[PDB]
Amino acid sequence: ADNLAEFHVQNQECDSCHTPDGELSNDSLTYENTQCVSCHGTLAEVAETTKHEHYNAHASHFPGEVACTSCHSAHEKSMVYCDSCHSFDFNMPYAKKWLRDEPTIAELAKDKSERQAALASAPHDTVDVVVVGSGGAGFSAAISATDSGAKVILIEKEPVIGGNAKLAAGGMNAAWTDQQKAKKITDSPELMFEDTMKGGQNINDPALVKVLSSHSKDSVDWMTAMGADLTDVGMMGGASVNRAHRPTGGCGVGAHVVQVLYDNAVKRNIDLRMNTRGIEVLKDDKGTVKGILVKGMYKGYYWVKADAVILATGGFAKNNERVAKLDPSLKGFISTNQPGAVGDGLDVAENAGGALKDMQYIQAHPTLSVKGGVMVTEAVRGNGAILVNREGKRFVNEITTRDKASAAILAQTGKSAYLIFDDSVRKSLCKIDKYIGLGVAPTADSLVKLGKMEGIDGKALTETVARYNSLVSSGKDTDFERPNLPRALNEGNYYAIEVTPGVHHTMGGVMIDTKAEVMNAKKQVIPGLYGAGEVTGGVHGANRLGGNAISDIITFGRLAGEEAAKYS
Length: 568
Ligand SMILES: Cc1cc2nc3c(=O)[nH]c(=O)nc-3n(C[C@H](O)[C@H](O)[C@H](O)COP(=O)(O)OP(=O)(O)OC[C@H]3O[C@@H](n4cnc5c(N)ncnc54)[C@H](O)[C@@H]3O)c2cc1C
Ligand code: HEC
Ligand code: HEC
Ligand code: HEC
Ligand code: HEC
Ligand SMILES: O=C([O-])[C@H](O)C=C([O-])O
Ligand code: NA
Prior knowledge:
It contains 18 helices and 21 strands. The protein is an alpha/beta fold and 568 residues long. The strands form five sheets. The chain has a six-stranded mixed β-sheet with strand order 7-3-2-11-20-19, covered by helices on one side. Helix 5 (136-147) runs parallel beside helix 18 (548-567), helix 7 (189-199) packs across helix 8 and helix 8 (206-225) packs across helix 18 (548-567). The protein binds flavin-adenine dinucleotide, heme C (4 copies), malate like intermediate (TEO) and sodium ion. One heme C is lined by residues 54-55, 57, 60-62, 81-82, 84-86, 167, 169, 252, 338, 374-375, 434, 437-438. In the C-terminal section; belongs to the FAD-dependent oxidoreductase 2 family. FRD/SDH subfamily. This is Fumarate reductase (cytochrome). The active site is at residue 402.
C-alpha cells in the first residue's frame, strides 16, 4: 500500500476511522484518533510493542496525550515528529523524511480568497479570551483567565502541546521560596532582580524585571498548588545563590510543568485546539480587539469573536534566517528549539499594530551536544561539572553568563569544548542520565582513558581535574574565579560531553507593559491585546539568565490571563 488508509481499507470500511457523514471531527482529529486507539490501544499500550533499549517512538519525554495523527497521517505519507531533533533508527510505515515548510504569515496573504469568505461568515465561536500557543505562558494564561471567570479557547499550531517549554531542563528561578528555605538557602526577590539586571547588561526594562522577581515566589506557589514538584533548587549561571527550582533529584522542569498545566487545563474543560494556527488579530472600528482569524489544518479558515487575544507564541530561535539578519554571528548555528519556533507570532503581533523591541539580542546556549544536536543543561555545570578544551585545560568560569561562556567555548580549538564530570555529579542531577541514554556521554574509569577516547590530552586532563579538585577543597577558584564549587570530581567513573553553542532564546519581541498589554510604537496600549512569554521583549535584555524563562512564562502568562479576563 502507498498510504496508511489504503492499508486499512483492504479489510475495513471508511467509517472504521470516520464519523457517519465523513466530515473530520475538528482540527485536533479527536474522533479519528479515538478510533485508532479503539483498535490499537493508547499510546502507552502501543509503546509496549515498539521498545528499543534506549528509545521508543511511542514513549517519549513529550507531555500530554500525543495524538496518533501527529506522526501517522491516513491518506498520505507522513513524518516522524522526533526526526525534527533526533535521528533514531525508525521504520514507521508510510514514513517520509522530516521537512518543515510552513508558510509565513505574509505568504498566507495569498489566501485572500478563503480568508475573505471566512471573515464574511458568522464567527465559529464567541468567547471571552483566545490564547494563542500551548507553551507554559499560554497554558498559564488559559488557566488563570478560566479561574477568573472567562471562557477561553486555547489554540496550538503544532500537532503536539508544549512548545519549547516542554523541553526545559535546568529549572524555574524564584526567590525567596519555601522550597529554598527547606534546603537552607538564603535569597531575596531583590537579589534575583539585581542578578537579572546585571546579567542582562542593564538593558532589561526594570519595571518588567520587578514583576519577574516580585511575582516569582507566587508563581512557584501557584504551580505547586496545581501539583508541581519544584522542591529541588539548583545553581545556574550568573546567579548569586541557588534559585533554579525543579523536580526532586534534579529531573527536567519543563516536561513536568507542561504536564501539570495540561492536566489542570483538562480538569477545567478548557477548549484546546491542535493544528490550529493564529493568523490575524481582528480589530473593531476603534482599534480594540474583536477576535482572531485562525487556520485549522483540517477544517480551514475560521474566526473566533472575543474581547481579548493573548499572544503566547514563543520565540524565533529556530528561524536561522531571521536570527542571522539580526545577529550575523549566529548564522549557520544549530538550534535547541522545536521546529515551529520561527516567529510567526511576532508577525501576527506587528500586523495588529504591536511594536517590537530588543530584537537584536539573541542568546546562544553555550552547551549543545555536538554528537546529539540537543541542549545539554546548564545544570550539569551548576551541579559541578567543568569545561575543558582539547588541550585538556579549563578555560572559563563555567557558571558565568551565557554570552561569555559561549564566546569562550567558540574561542577554543575546534570551536567546541567538553563537559567533564564524575559519578558524584551524575548522581546529583537526574537529568544527566538522559544524556547517557542518548549516547552522548562517553565514560571511562580514568581521565587518561577518557582523553584518549575523546581526543583530549589525557595527562593534561588528569592534572586539570586534580588541580580543580584542589581548588574545590581550598574553596577558591584562583584560576577562573568560579564563585561556587559544589563538588569534587572524584567519585567513580568520569564522563565527557562534547559541547558547542547553539541558538536558543530570543530576548526581543513584542513590547508589553507590566500588565502584559501590547503597545504600539507610540507606546499606546492596543486594547484587548496581550503578550506573554518568550514572544515578548524587555524582560531579559541583552542576555537572559538560565532559569529565568520558565519564571517569566508562568508569571506573565498568569498575569495576562487575569488581566484579559478583567478586561473581559
Ligand atoms: C531545550 C530547551 C531547554 C530549555 N530550558 C530552560 C530551563 O530549564 N529554564 C528556563 O528558564 N528556560 C529554559 N528554556 C527556555 C524556555 O523553555 C522557553 O523560553 C519557553 O519555552 C518560552 O515559553 P513560551 O510559553 O513563551 O513559548 P513556547 O513554550 O515556545 O510555546 C509557544 C507555543 O506557541 C506556538 N505557536 C507559535 N505561533 C503560533 C501561532 N501563530 N498560532 C498558534 N500557535 C502558535 C508554538 O508552536 C509553541 O507550541 C529552554 C528552551 C529549550 C529550547
Ligand atoms: C488511526 C488513524 C490509525 C492509526 C494511526 C493506525 N491504525 Fe491500524 N490496524 C488495524 C489492524 C487490524 C492492523 C493490522 C495489524 C494488526 O493486526 O494489528 C493495523 C495496522 C496498522 C499499522 C501498520 C500498517 C502496515 O503497513 O503494516 C499502523 C501504523 C496503524 N495500523 C496505525 C486496526 C485498526 C482499526 C480497527 C478497526 C482502526 C480504526 C485503525 N487500525 C486505525 C489506525
Ligand atoms: C483510518 C486509518 C482512516 C481510514 C481507513 C480512512 N480515513 Fe479518511 N481520513 C483519516 C484521517 C486521519 C484524515 C485526516 C487527514 C489524513 O490523511 O490524515 C482523513 C481525511 C479524509 C478526507 C479529507 C477530508 C477533508 O479534507 O475535509 C477524506 C475525503 C477522506 N478521509 C475519505 C475517506 C474515505 C472515503 C475512506 C474509505 C475509503 C477513508 N477516508 C478511509 C482516516 C482514515
Ligand atoms: C510520532 C511521535 C508517533 C506517534 C505520536 C505515534 N506513532 Fe506509531 N509509530 C511511529 C514510529 C516512528 C513507528 C516505527 C517505530 C520503530 O521503532 O521503528 C511507529 C509504529 C507504529 C505501529 C507499528 C508497530 C509494529 O508492530 O511494527 C503502529 C501499529 C503504530 N505506530 C500505531 C500508533 C498509534 C495507534 C498511535 C497513537 C496512539 C501512534 N502510533 C502514535 C511514530 C509515532
Ligand atoms: C527538539 C525540539 C526535540 C524533539 C522534537 C524531541 N526531542 Fe528527544 N530530546 C531533546 C532534548 C533536548 C534531549 C536531551 C535530554 C533531555 O531530556 O533534555 C532529548 C533526549 C531524548 C532521549 C534520550 C533521553 C530519554 O528521554 O530517554 C530520547 C530517547 C528521546 N529524546 C526521544 C524522543 C522521541 C521518541 C521524540 C518524539 C516523540 C523526541 N525525542 C522528540 C529534544 C527533542
Ligand atoms: O540549561 C538549561 O537547562 C536551560 O536551557 C536553561 C535555560 O533557562 O534556558
Ligand atoms: Na523574547
